[PDB]
Amino acid sequence: MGTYKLILNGKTLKGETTTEAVDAATAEKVFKQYANDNGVDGEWTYDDATKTFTVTE
After folding, report:
1. Phi, psi for residue 6 in degrees, rounded to 5
2. Alpha-carbon separation of residue 29 from 3, 17, 23, 32 (angstroms)
3. In 3D, which of 16, 18, 11, 20 has the Cα closest to residue 41?
4. Where are the sequence repeats?
5. 1-57 maps to which CATH number?
């Protein structure tokens, strides 16, 4: 597997968490719960080189 670094990059608040899965779609699907619960809903963009997945709002 690979560890995806979730970075909440919002217009009011931010967050930083980490979760590993077989693919990007699982990282996104799972973290969306927390993202919207925390108050961030934006553009989900991934970088496999850095293993980062930023939600920019």
Report:
1. -95, 125
2. 14, 14, 10, 6
3. 11
4. 3-57
5. 3.10.20.10
> Are 44 and 53 spatial neighbours (Cβ–Cβ below 8 Å)?
yes
Q: If we measure between CA atoms, which residue out of 22, 16, 8, 17 comes closest to residue 55? A: 8
- Burial class of 16 by CB neighbour count within 10 A (0 to 12, 13 to 18, 19+): exposed
Residues 6+ apart with CB under 8 A from 17: 5, 6, 8, 31, 34
* Alpha helix positions (H), 1-57: 24-38
Which experiment gave this structure? NMR
Separation CA 53–CA 36 (nearest Å): 15
Q: How many angstroms separate the CA atoms of 5 and 48, rounded? A: 10
